[PDB]
């Protein structure tokens, strides 16, 4: 009774930024 | 009433002292087997 990501994430990240994102100049 | 050739057959063969002495000698194993799922469970809750 008693006994009881980093790396995908930045690129994750990236590809959501740079894809959502928008300015002319870049 | 013995009912059965082979139970006087055993009971001729059966020495009594001998199956007093093997009948204490599985008493204190199954004693000792007791104290092994006691500790067991100390272990257990520790």
């Known amino acids: 009774v008693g006994f009881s990501e980093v790396v ?3 690129w994750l990240n990236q590809y959501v930024l ?4 928008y300015d002319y100049n870049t | ?4 050739y082979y139970e006087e057959s055993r009971g001729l063969e059966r020495d009594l002292i001998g199956e007093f002495v093997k009948s ?3 008493a204190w194993r199954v004693a ?3 104290g092994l799922f006691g500790l067991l469970g100390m ?3 520790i």
């Not at chain 1, 740079?18 to 994102?21: G, K, L, S, T, V």
């Not at chain 2, 009433?1 to 059965?4: A, C, G, M, N």
């Open chain 2, 43 to 45: 272990v257990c809750g």
């Open chain 2, 32 to 34: 000792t087997a007791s």
């Open chain 1, 8 to 10: 995908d994430t930045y």
């Open chain 2, 1 to 4: 009433q013995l009912k059965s």
């Open chain 2, 24 to 26: 204490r000698k599985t």
């Open chain 1, 18 to 21: 740079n894809r959502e994102a």
